[PDB]
Amino acid sequence: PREIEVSEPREVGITELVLRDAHQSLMATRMAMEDMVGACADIDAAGYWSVECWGGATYDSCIRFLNEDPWERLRTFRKLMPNSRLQMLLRGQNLLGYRHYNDEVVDRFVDKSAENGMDVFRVFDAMNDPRNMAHAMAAVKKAGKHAQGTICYTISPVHTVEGYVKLAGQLLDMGADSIALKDMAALLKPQPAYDIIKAIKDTYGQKTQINLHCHSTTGVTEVSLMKAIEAGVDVVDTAISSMSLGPGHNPTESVAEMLEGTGYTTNLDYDRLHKIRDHFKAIRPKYKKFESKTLVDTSIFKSQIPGGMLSNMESQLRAQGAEDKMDEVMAEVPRVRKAAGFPPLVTPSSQIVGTQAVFNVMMGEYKRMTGEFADIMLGYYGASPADRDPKVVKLAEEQSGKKPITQRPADLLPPEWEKQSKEAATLKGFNGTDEDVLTYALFPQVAPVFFEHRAEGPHSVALTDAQLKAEA
Amino acid sequence: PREIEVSEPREVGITELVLRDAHQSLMATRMAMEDMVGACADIDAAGYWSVECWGGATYDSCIRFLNEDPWERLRTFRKLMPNSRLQMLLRGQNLLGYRHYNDEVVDRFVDKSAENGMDVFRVFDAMNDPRNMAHAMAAVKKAGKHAQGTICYTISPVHTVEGYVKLAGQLLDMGADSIALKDMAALLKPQPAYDIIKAIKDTYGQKTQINLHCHSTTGVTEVSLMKAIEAGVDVVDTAISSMSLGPGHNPTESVAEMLEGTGYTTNLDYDRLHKIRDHFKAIRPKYKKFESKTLVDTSIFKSQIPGGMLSNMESQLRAQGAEDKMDEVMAEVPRVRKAAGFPPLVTPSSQIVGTQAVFNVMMGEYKRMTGEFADIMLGYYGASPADRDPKVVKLAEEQSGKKPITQRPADLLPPEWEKQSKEAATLKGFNGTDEDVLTYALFPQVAPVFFEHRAEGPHSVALTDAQLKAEA
């Protein structure tokens, strides 16, 4: 009489990702604001637990490609979806930028984000070092908003159910209002989803709120959602059907429909979901120039290498003739990752390990380390899940003259707001707001250009209706 | 302490659909034989329970568009995959044709199919009338092959778990070597999958072999596969990852990977699966002119109308100006189906009900019934799941002068082989084989043209490598 224990019948919450992660994963975050607003009213009345609509790569995209002010995008969504819990993805001490910042910047950014309407802050760190998440978290609590501590899921010799339960505890210990299990690479299998979700519930209590974010890259995560729901998961993330699958996510409608008769239910307005879906089915074709060309890829389960990392390393060897050695790089990546203490292979970690793998294949084993890689071995990105190869660490120290550190990298950073402020105020177009100063601090190289063109209004790099017909 | 009982740890069998249903669902059965053979050796060594590679719409496609002889395709697959159980889809008394045939034709077709290498015959009837399946089944047993009785899954007021358990019993009663639950529209939800699968096991025994065939049209069937496996399902059908999803099926690799740690396992050679996958990833782009443009559609759960039926009805109103009334037709379909005794909405049933719905919207309620629709109401397609509206039946009788029948439609059919033989032998190109006579009997209108051009060899209607680059 073999049996599985499942959570008591209950309503499961849904977080819609169409406005942020979905298009970031499917069309390089190129989705224009004018192609989104027409769906806000319906999304707002759909019945979602939260609506992910800011953060992640959208800040960069807004200013770099769309000549759009992120803060204006945030203000508009807040206005167009007044009844909803807006959600964002924030990479801890890196905020939405390229480097860790002094705490005062984190304070400023979070504060201005809450001030403009952000309700739920999913804070995460690419290395999974809770220290890098600690200040952002506190900042979110101070603004009286929902702080969601993030655990980046991954598979490696050092990652275990126990290790994740511990990390969860650390997150709760720093005031997490909830825990997000983030599986960007779709590495979370069904059984593991059930065990981890249950392990955390059994350990910290049923009251412990867990939100599961799984991409559908590998094709197995929708089954993992079911198992997570049986393990008692509180909220799962999805993407409206016309903007789903591939490197994207599981379909909202599908996740809602698959529960009928299980005892579990979602409570989303199906007719509203249908409008949201059609809205995007009409719009999506315009972005064909940015679609990925693969729907299902399970290779990562064996290679441990994500595609977005795979193609990139290829473009390096290809644009360097040694495109044949792609098999030697494939074998080198694991070794480099291990040397780095097995960090989750997500941006930036992924790029760093990828590029470094290429070097060891060509110029020889760590004969020359990038500055970024050296910074990882030396601790400037924080602590790794496992201890790093002391030998490779030493080399790094001998190739950069930098001294190893083991404490939160932000502890060494000096106040910078005043400096950033003065510098931003010298740029043509600057409007005086901290918002603008933050844009400059997060993107020194783009802020100037953006500030000068912003008055032109946001644009779109998607095909026009004209262009669509003119092709077909 | 809520709990679910799951089957004992065990190996689950997999049936690969890439060679038949996958391309029929994703690229209108246009897949050229030369684009397939290069994958046979690997598919043969993959470890699948069976390989669906013939039947369904491939016969028609081979002779109508590819100038290819189906029997030659069957002989080649048999040769290229000597170690595998080949499988086919056969629509009962209709064989792979357009009408029910006299038993002697069924005998001839099945016999020649086994003779040329077919091992597993999935026999099914669009109305789910076991009588229409009875003779084909027996014929398969006589050839000493595996007879798989099919239950076309659907949702309707008359379809219940009990109703399916009964149908299963009828299938076993006529010698079924196994039962196939076929969900062409991806209507099978997780709970129902578990209940039905278990209901049949609990009722006829664990020894009862059940094979589940779910399309991924609605996005919920991979979760249903898991539940079916927990309910004890023996074999599930999948499509190699590069030829999956959409109106197609769940990914083979994904289904294999999602089981890790559950106690269940598949035993497929992952490296072989990888070659099969790459083989088709390279080839698939050439068929872009035949792809569907939707990946996930849950609308059918509310409308009860499949897309392939939906678009067709639209092309009727569109090519007739009354494209506005598409909402009136949408409401009429349910009514017509009910009148017909709720048959599963799969070909031919779907087309018949669709077209008839259009008429009632225009010319008025059954003011004019098609001959096909009249035949359904009158019983010439067999028995319906539920009793048909006696009023609509009467009308049919008064608009066709045909008398209602309730017995197996084939009971009225006269011997025809001799007739078909003589007629086929008058065509230029005819080679004398029963195989050819069968081609003529199944496709009177095409056989002549095919026989005349066959010597040219099979062709492809897919883009060429040249054409691909010349576009991109």
Ligand SMILES: O=C([O-])CC(=O)C(=O)O
């Ligand atoms: O999928 C995620 O949540 C991770 C993400 O977008 C990012 O790295 O910016």
Ligand SMILES: O=C([O-])CC(=O)C(=O)O
């Ligand atoms: O999916 C199925 O098995 C049904 C099918 O192909 C057909 O109607 O020819």
Ligand SMILES: [Co+2]
């Ligand atoms: Co994501």
Ligand SMILES: [Co+2]
């Ligand atoms: Co099918």
